[PDB]
Amino acid sequence: EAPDVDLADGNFYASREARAAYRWMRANQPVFRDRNGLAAASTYQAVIDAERQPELFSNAGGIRPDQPALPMMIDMDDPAHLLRRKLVNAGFTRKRVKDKEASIAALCDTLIDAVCERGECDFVRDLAAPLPMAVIGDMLGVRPEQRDMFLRWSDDLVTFLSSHVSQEDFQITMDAFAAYNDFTRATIAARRADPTDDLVSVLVSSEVDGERLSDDELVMETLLILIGGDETTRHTLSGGTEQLLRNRDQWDLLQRDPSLLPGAIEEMLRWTAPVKNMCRVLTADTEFHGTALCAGEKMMLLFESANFDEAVFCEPEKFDVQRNPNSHLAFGFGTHFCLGNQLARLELSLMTERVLRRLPDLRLVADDSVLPLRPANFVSGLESMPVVFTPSPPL
Ligand code: HEM
Ligand SMILES: c1ccc(Cc2ccncc2)cc1
């Protein structure tokens, strides 16, 4: 019989029995309906096929199951979406991202310098969460001593998207947005008067076919980037490193052969799938991989389920840094394929290279620990990951 699950309940995604439920879906009802009737594409094939049909599976109803659209690229269809994406793309050209390498590396070394003398840290609190926050904060002009403020606002906003909030938590979300709005409009005004080379400066100057971003659009698109920057990669850093530590043959392989790091990062992404789902709204009734879908309902794309689909990935519960091919869907596919994917990959590579080299005997405090995952229906990963290592002097 079907698993009795609610795919909008954050407790489902904090359960290490989610993957057992996904297995049932893929084998028995690939386009699954949960206990409340919510539709979800569980196979790699169904996710790809929906992604390739944006006119039928739209983003314009919003990408969460129980919330309306916001005025940002991810909640738009082409052609409007393409113009918005092209405008924002000025901040994420291959050259502009690759040029951040030196500054990202410096942040990695500063963060490791803060714990390397101690012999213990919480990998989540001290390395995985702060590095992406510092990178994206630096891009947006956030002072180092205000990073924690922005990360708290970000946590509130992604929690709003990851749940059905109470009235008090709705008020907190609105207050967080108001504070972000205020800060960002001050930045816009300053960069319109004295442009620099930071992200707001590049976005203010971006032009596509005589069109530019308005101040309202700049606020919304930079907020999408802030939350991508500081609520996603952290979970691949923590959960990916956790798999290296739980399978020490994998750790040992990477330490003796740095040319394996690109494939390792892709396997960390496949495994961790920090974005558990994005929704699509049906523009018409349709029969889709055996399940009848109705115009106006939302269907989830289950990216973690796709990433463990045995039709595509041999022995998917084996973590293998050498996996080739590894065409995972952690960043999605198609029109809305993550705009930040290169920056996320660069952060993952640079921090993991340095962790391997500077903390070479890193291990989990309890090798048979089951560590807790964040209850959230949208983005999730490890809450805490205590690790020990031989101390060393800072750089
Ligand atoms: C490992 C980290 C990340 C993961 C797993 C992730 C995942 C995703 C996914 C699944 C989508 C939607 C794709 C679809 O529905 O097919 C998306 C879109 C997007 N992401 Fe990320 N993301 C990450 C990091 C980032 C970062 C660092 C940024 C910016 C600095 C960013 C900016 C965006 C933007 C702007 C979009 C919307 C693109 C569009 O609608 O055309 N993301 N991301
Ligand atoms: C609205 C929609 C999504 C997000 C989170 C998000 C951002 C970038 N890539 C992956 C996830 C925040 C606000």
Side-chain angles (χ1 to χ4, degrees), residues 1-93 96-167 169-193 195-366 368-395:
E1 182 53 24
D4 178 24
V5 295
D6 177 348
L7 292 177
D9 183 348
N11 288 323
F12 172 83
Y13 299 94
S15 168
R16 300 189 174 273
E17 310 200 63
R19 287 217 287 268
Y22 295 150
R23 271 206 298 289
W24 191 93
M25 304 176 194
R26 296 195 304 272
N28 295 278
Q29 195 189 36
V31 180
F32 177 73
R33 290 199 182 269
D34 76 4
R35 73 188 302 275
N36 300 131
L38 178 58
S42 70
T43 57
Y44 191 104
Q45 187 72 57
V47 170
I48 290 300
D49 286 347
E51 293 277 35
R52 284 169 155 170
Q53 297 179 262
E55 300 182 9
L56 180 56
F57 294 97
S58 168
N59 278 51
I63 49 69
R64 300 317 304 136
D66 49 350
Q67 302 171 16
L70 300 181
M72 32 161 93
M73 81 165 73
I74 199 168
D75 288 348
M76 301 167 65
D77 299 327
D78 290 341
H81 159 267
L82 191 49
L83 173 61
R84 185 70 62 83
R85 183 171 174 128
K86 285 185 166 149
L87 283 164
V88 176
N89 188 79
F92 296 87
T93 63
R96 264 193 91 80
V97 173
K98 218 270 199 283
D99 286 348
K100 273 224 98 191
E101 179 162 351
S103 62
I104 297 171
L107 283 166
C108 290
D109 281 314
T110 294
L111 288 166
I112 292 171
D113 281 353
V115 300
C116 61
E117 286 168 306
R118 291 156 178 211
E120 197 277 352
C121 72
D122 183 336
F123 194 90
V124 170
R125 188 194 56 219
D126 300 327
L127 294 171
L131 181 280
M133 169 76 237
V135 171
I136 208 71
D138 284 2
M139 278 163 58
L140 292 166
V142 179
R143 297 185 73 89
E145 68 272 22
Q146 297 186 12
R147 284 164 185 163
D148 278 344
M149 184 178 317
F150 277 71
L151 195 53
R152 228 265 181 201
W153 302 339
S154 298
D155 291 341
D156 293 338
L157 293 162
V158 80
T159 293
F160 175 84
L161 301 167
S162 288
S163 67
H164 176 258
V165 297
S166 61
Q167 178 57 43
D169 285 338
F170 178 82
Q171 190 60 69
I172 294 180
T173 305
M174 285 328 284
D175 297 341
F177 178 81
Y180 178 80
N181 179 70
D182 184 69
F183 177 92
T184 306
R185 282 171 186 279
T187 303
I188 297 174
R191 301 301 183 268
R192 277 178 191 291
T196 67
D197 202 3
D198 70 354
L199 178 61
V200 169
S201 293
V202 163
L203 290 180
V204 154
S205 290
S206 184
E207 198 187 303
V208 177
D209 302 330
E211 298 289 358
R212 299 209 173 191
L213 295 165
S214 69
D215 283 2
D216 291 348
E217 289 163 349
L218 285 161
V219 173
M220 282 286 171
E221 296 301 338
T222 57
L223 184 54
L224 179 60
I225 286 158
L226 168 70
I227 300 167
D230 68 14
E231 294 298 338
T232 62
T233 308
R234 61 198 289 175
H235 300 308
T236 299
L237 271 176
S238 63
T241 303
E242 185 196 16
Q243 288 306 309
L244 296 176
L245 299 176
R246 293 204 178 273
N247 304 285
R248 269 207 107 81
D249 60 300
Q250 297 290 288
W251 177 267
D252 292 340
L253 266 174
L254 279 191
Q255 223 161 239
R256 64 193 199 51
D257 191 350
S259 79
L260 296 183
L261 185 62
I265 293 314
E266 298 307 305
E267 185 74 334
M268 288 168 64
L269 286 160
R270 183 186 71 87
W271 188 275
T272 58
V275 176
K276 301 308 179 183
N277 52 72
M278 283 290 168
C279 293
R280 299 293 182 259
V281 66
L282 273 291
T283 64
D285 300 340
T286 199
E287 172 74 14
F288 187 61
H289 282 289
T291 295
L293 304 171
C294 306
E297 80 173 309
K298 276 178 182 179
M299 190 191 71
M300 301 180 149
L301 308 173
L302 299 174
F303 297 121
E304 190 181 339
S305 185
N307 282 0
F308 284 81
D309 187 339
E310 46 295 315
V312 171
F313 301 100
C314 182
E315 292 203 302
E317 290 282 357
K318 191 190 172 253
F319 187 90
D320 188 345
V321 298
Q322 301 177 273
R323 198 173 278 278
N324 172 17
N326 197 348
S327 301
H328 64 78
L329 303 187
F331 294 121
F333 180 82
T335 301
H336 294 277
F337 177 71
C338 178
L339 186 60
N341 78 93
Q342 182 188 355
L343 178 61
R345 282 169 163 130
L346 186 57
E347 293 173 4
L348 292 166
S349 184
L350 290 170
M351 179 55 91
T352 299
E353 179 176 43
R354 275 152 186 79
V355 166
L356 286 161
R357 168 159 51 76
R358 296 190 58 192
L359 315 174
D361 63 347
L362 190 70
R363 64 169 182 281
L364 292 165
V365 158
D368 43 9
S369 53
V370 304
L371 298 158
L373 297 164
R374 175 149 212 183
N377 76 12
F378 184 32
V379 178
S380 179
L382 288 163
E383 296 185 358
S384 172
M385 183 171 128
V387 293
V388 290
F389 52 88
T390 298
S392 63
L395 307 179

